[PDB]
Amino acid sequence: NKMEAKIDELINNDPVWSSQNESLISKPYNHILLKPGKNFRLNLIVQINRVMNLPKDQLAIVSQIVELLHNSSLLIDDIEDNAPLRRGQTTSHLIFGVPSTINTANYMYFRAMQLVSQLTTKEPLYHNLITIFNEELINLHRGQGLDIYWRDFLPEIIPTQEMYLNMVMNKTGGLFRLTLRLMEALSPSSHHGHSLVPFINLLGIIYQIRDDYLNLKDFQMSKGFAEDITEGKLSFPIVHALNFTKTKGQTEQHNEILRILLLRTSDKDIKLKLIQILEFDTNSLAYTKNFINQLVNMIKNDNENKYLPELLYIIDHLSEL
């Protein structure tokens, strides 16, 4: 009867979980926290709040949700890309193992979800906030799924520039839109002008493309290691080169771009060969730089504020988010 008594108690209570247990499974997450970036994201949220006027406490919870989603996304991204370093340091999966890191990142997606409850007690607003959360986590995973598919099954699908931009709207725009949409739903301010969603989609596009561009340009210049080549990613410049070489009939160059991506190599000279093919042969680096400038000018020349509601500064430090 003593075992029966014991089982009886176990099953009539909530599952036992200790603060010691909590710390053990938080290791992969605690490790990525040590990296900087938190204040730059906080800074963009703060600037956007000059329009939305959420009270300090509410804004802090939006910020916590964003940090959990963002950091958990990176933990997963690094396992998905086989990345050995992030912000200059060893990637969590290489320390704690892939199993713990997947589970912990996934665990934090649900802690983020739980925080949404803390934003309001109003039932109609709550429903809306969780919908926004749900929609953008679905968008996020769709774009990421496509990015991974193209890369890992290359050359099955060679994306065009239009496909790439749609993938980024889902993958990168997800977190930017999730944050803005939560703020717009919670805003006490009557009408603070048109929605900023178009503006935030544009920031996400500039962000990803610049990210892609700098990963190669920094290596060309010195700084980095063009780890995107090692990963075989269909980045903005790679997408332009692949489509450029096809439409120009440069058969050998097109096949060599593909061969190098498929090697998943860490040879610096081989990565530099490809980078210089994009520099001199397909003019993909210059095309990309100009594309970025054009995107940034869409905001810098937005005199009638159809996009815009400090923000210029953020744009120049977008790589630091």
Ligand X SMILES: CCCCCCCCCCOc1cc(-c2cc(F)cc(F)c2)c[n+](CC(P(=O)(O)O)P(=O)(O)O)c1
Type of residue numbered 133: F
For residue 297, the minimal CB distance to a copy of itself (Å) is 9
Interface residue with a copy of itself, options 35, 85, 110, 276 (CB under 8 A): 110
The reply to whether 69 sits near a copy of itself by the rule CB under 8 A is no
Q: Which one, 251 or 293, has the nearer CB to a copy of itself?
A: 293
Q: Which one, 134 or 189, has the nearer CB to a copy of itself?
A: 134
Sign of torsion over alpha carbons 26, 27, 29, 30 = positive
Site size for a copy of itself (CB under 8 A): 68
For residue 286, the minimal CB distance to ligand X (Å) is 21
Name the residues that contact ligand X, by CB under 6 A.
41, 44-45, 48, 66, 70, 73-74, 76-77, 80-81, 140-141, 143-144, 171-172, 174-176, 179, 207, 211, 321
CA angle 281-285-286, nearest 5°? 95
Interface residue with a copy of itself, options 61, 79, 182, 229 (CB under 8 A): 79
The reply to whether 88 sits near a copy of itself by the rule CB under 8 A is no
* Euclidean distance between CA atoms 305 and 194, whole angstroms: 10
Judge whether 111 is annotated as a binding position: no
Structure tokens belonging to residue 228: 């995107």
Sign of torsion over alpha carbons 33, 39, 40, 42 = positive
Q: Which one, 130 or 270, has the nearer CB to a copy of itself?
A: 130
* Euclidean distance between CA atoms 40 and 65, whole angstroms: 15
Q: Which one, 81 or 184, has the nearer CB to ligand X?
A: 81
Whole-number Cα distances in Å, 52 to 129, 185, 189, 191: 15, 9, 6, 10
- DSSP letters for 165-209: HHHHHHHTHHHHHHHHHHHHHH---S--SS-SHHHHHHHHHHHHH
* 17 contacts: CB under 8 Å, gap ≥ 6: none
Whole-number Cα distances in Å, 126 to 113, 122, 182: 12, 6, 10
Structure tokens belonging to residue 272: 């530099």
For residue 31, the minimal CB distance to ligand X (Å) is 16
In the list a copy of itself, ligand X, none, the entry touching 45 (Cβ below 5 to 8 angstroms by class) is ligand X
CA dihedral 279, 151, 317, 93 (to 10 degrees): -130
Q: Which one, 38 or 141, has the nearer CB to a copy of itself?
A: 141
Binding site for a copy of itself (CB under 8 A): 3-4, 7-8, 10-12, 15-17, 21-22, 24-25, 76, 79-81, 96-100, 102-104, 106-107, 109-111, 113-114, 117, 123-124, 126-127, 130-131, 134, 137-139, 141-146, 148-149, 152, 165-166, 169-170, 173, 197-199, 201-202, 205, 291, 294-295, 298
Residues contributing to the annotated binding site: 38, 41, 70, 77, 81, 86-87, 171-172, 208, 215, 223, 233
